[PDB]
């Protein structure tokens, strides 16, 4: 059976290489698409069989039969479709010029940015979502009367993914001379020099480089534009934020969306609801208006209404792994606030992806390409939450549900569920669960709902029974009263995330699951006792709990909210690579050996400063004023968060030197008198005071962002005075 | 089984020919890459099976089974992937013009070289590493105000690997006339004559020939440039040193590297450490700055950071054997000082490559292409040590570890080690050894560490056990207390290099290994007794020991530090091809028959000069003044090194005539009075005096390099006076 496993592994590797090769091009051939789907199904079957054999080897007849039948299927596919297997390995946009809604103020903003500045060649980059309207705004600015009056020469160059520098340079030359047959033998650099002479002969010039996709194209084309100490400007529209390094183009409002839809259809509650569902994207409004123009003007045909090639331009530029990472963001429901940490852990568990660094790099790559929107950011600048735009969400859902079978949103029949690979259900979870589903190839069970669900006791073991091959089990919105004997049979589990109301103890049978990477226990009990062999899990990396978990007496990276009785030297000696640590166990009971620790959280007198780790970067104290001199000696502390009565006192005088502090966060304190000088916070950048101000922080060079919340008006006056003395101040 | 061995040899030969053919082109097809990897794996398996059969034949059932299964695998591969097997058989650079750091002095140097010289057409060649900045410096010089003022005509020609002479000539012509349609029927020689007329009509001309790759291109393009007795100049940038036969472009300093990185990212300790790790290569700085511009400006995302197509241009021009020789240099750790002799012997033993002459030619070819950097050179001009640049080291490591599986740096599992071919481990050697690794296909075990390691006795036979197919065993950084019975079972050994502290005797069972080529015994004992049948090793070529080895009573080329009791006529009659010989055995105890000897070393009254070999070229005496008249009669001696009290005396008067001496090396002597004239050293070029001067050596025509070290200031004054009377003098 082992040699059969090796042969099946070789077949699966060749099929995976074929799938990776065919993903480089989109095929419209239906036979090729069907063959690709068949090959993907066989690949999934082979993966499941190999994982089953691996689990049995770690711990057989049915496994052998499955391996034989999958090998036979592979041979049949190779023999039958050999020829198909071998065969499977410029229009500038027309934008609106007459009825442009909402861009009247953004156009003036960009124009005033173009008409003002230094005397050098400056660039005004416009970045935005696919179909946001960057070309429309660039055209409105390009044909504006003020721009035409100020700029003697205006040139519109349409760059794209595919362009020829010689063709572009000869197109630019034709705007100045008609005898372009004299350049048939000059090189592209001589063409650029000729363009430089042409542009320098006149006055100021404005150049619109539309749809720049890489900095390489920008550098190659820029050699034709002189910098002759005149206020020459370049207007650049791009999807990627890297090419702009800007002006982030706005979204249309609800009223503007309705205005655009009404103008496009008619040169109504149903119409207003249709325009509201486009989320301020003019491309969606245009597409839906083109669809509505063909239907009759009847309220019943507009209630039935309640593109794809433009998005594919940026989706086809993603790598093979980044495409699967991007499509997995469509599993989260529409408008959902995706937690970045949860998304990263899910990506690592699904096998798409230190691994955390690569996953954060993938998320930042998706954000830079404007495929993912950021809303919440951490105080230190990291991303906290994100979401997909509704058109991007629809694209991801359609692609991953139809063409890739990455996941299926849920009722499917017994024949349909046998082909599903991942399940995402957030509505009518109990109704689907009561049907007793059974999927032998389902690898993930996702349930992202913000409403808590209590799982009936009679239905407790249905998911571990019907889906025994689960690798990801994210049911943190479902309360599990108890664990059945079938949960411990999920030997393939890598990501487990459950919520509970009465689970005060983790059984030792959890340690029988040696594939666990992330163990998230969201319980409302005050204390939790983890009896499972945490240290015997060789693949465990993160352990998140919201209670005071008590660990039993290398790859581990996070130990969130453990009890201080579990802060022994023996326990900390088993986790040399720990980076984030939290304690929520009556701090008064009590980490030096953790030389890689960066995040520390204590939730409820400070010891000498030499006891705390010297490499700590972020420290947060919750429910625990002159004691801050101990935290001042921390030479590497950069973020300090005080939440929920973290530091209580009346008078605080700044004495210690926070040589590395960048963010100071104080929440729910009784501080009355605070005296400080610029010397005590040399590197301060971020200051947040919520539900709580010496004028010495205006002398700080790095102080640029200050956040204020509800408090006495004297604090608001002090903040306003500090702002008067770019600074960002917000008071609420 | 013999006929099966012949059939498998034929199959392996065909597969090797296929692998050699596909290496001529880089394939981006993933299916093709997987097929190439599979074919390489099968080739390795066939090679191991054939060598096992050869060893058994020299000295069976398992060998037959392995041969049958490998033949079946070959047939299956041939039948399955026949179509894939059959299918498997211009952008000038844009460089920085505004922010160029560090080149302000190099540009002035090259400019003063261009503006000064004779009245003929001179060339200023700029040679350097891939990405060093030759094009940037050439562009800075080309657009310099002084160059523009002095040279009326300046032409920038971009040569590359692929160029068309007609296209280049028509591009040059277009710089002088716009009616280039009159040249549609002239030959390229008439085009060159027209260019000659155009360039001779004006004044002086400067021409920048960028990226010249072969002297043939230089000769073909040079026919268009007249030599009209004006100070016409050509600026040439190339990677190969042969095309320049120059100006070796400098590397950016650490401060300059940080300046460039800061300028590129921001138009920090982490930033300084990132710029320091680029090793002064502006291409690496540019790439890392482009990478950093996409990440957020947070200290945590800059600590996570702690191209390839440019290097591939020079790597793809290497031959099939030179590519493997080059990638093997990446086995040595980063920044390691690779000994040239050890590298050559390793290349010969690995089968990449008299053989020593070819290996030295390969090393010099790699050096000329600027793929390998030379730091230490022998006193006679030969190369002693070398290293790889860190970008080249990374390229070699990545290529040989991912795409070729040439070697793997080390923990890998039992399934992963079954595919490894060579192992390089220099950190945590004992930890990996204690895991008891077992690789049935591992052919080399490399450990290049400068820190000595004592090998536990319980772990002594682990390497000969887990790796029974070893061909190269370089563990000279590991001390072996004793030899286990498994060491003598390594019948495939070709290169054995071990260190020891108490091994005073080599067992006779070493002679059972008849495949040994290099036998390096690095022991700290004063004397060593080699009982193995050295003369029975028909393939032994080099025998290096640091102790007084006592040999027992044709291919041999080196016998380093043997005892003079082993300098008998009988022993020397068995080695007619010996070229290097050393003796470290109390020289007072005592080679004429060695008619091919070149190097002789005696380590502790001279006999008549007719006793010493007449062919001797280099002689070194260690611990052994009027006796130098005996060495003077040596008509072919060119290098004479005196180290560690080699020649002791008070007064030395030069009498003998060193008609062929080129290098004189004196170290740690008590010489007080030295009298000499130009007649006694007619051919002297190199003079080194360390830890020890008549003015008669200034009359020597060939005296150009003099090296001095710590001594009395009178010697420094004499050296300075000699320099006053190009000469290279260094005093420390
Ligand atoms: N403010 C607007 N008013 C009216 N129509 C608009 C407006 N903005 C965009 N459109 C229209 O919606 C579509 C959006 O395409 P457009 O070229 O403006 O987008 P883009 O930002 O350049 O996107 P892409 O990245 O795909 O090039 C076009 O048909 C355009 O005419
Ligand atoms: N001194 C410098 N200051 C700033 N940027 C530099 C400097 N030297 C090189 N660069 C930049 O680094 C890269 C090096 O490429 P460059 O063309 O200068 O190298 P090269 O010596 O011609 O190499 P190749 O053999 O690959 O052609 C370019 O992007 C160039 O702009």
Residue numbers in the entry:
A (entry chain A), B (entry chain B): 27 to 85, 103 to 132, 144 to 299, 308 to 329, 338 to 376, 392 to 438, 445 to 501, 509 to 651, ...
Question: Which statements did the authors publish about this structure?
Answer:
NRCs are essential helper NLR (nucleotide-binding domain and leucine-rich repeat) proteins that execute immune responses triggered by sensor NLRs. Asterids—the largest group of flowering plants—have a complex immune receptor network composed of a multitude of sensor CC-NLRs that can signal redundantly via downstream helper MADA-type CC-NLRs, the NRCs (NLRs required for cell death).
We used an NbNRC2 variant with mutations in its N-terminal MADA motif (NbNRC2EEE), which was previously identified to abolish cell death induction without compromising receptor activation and oligomerization. In the reconstruction, density was observed within the groove formed between the NB domain and HD1 domain of each protomer that is well modeled by a molecule of adenosine triphosphate (ATP). The ATP phosphate groups are coordinated by NB domain residues T189, T190, K188, and R293, and the adenine base is within a hydrophobic pocket bordered by F156 and V356. The most extensive interaction that stabilizes the central part of the resistosome is formed by the embedding of each HD1 domain within a concave surface of the adjacent protomer lined by the NB, WHD, and LRR regions. At the interface between NB domains, aspartate D239 and cysteine C241 from one protomer contact threonine T234 and asparagine N225 at distances of 3.3 and 4.4 Å, respectively, in the other protomer.
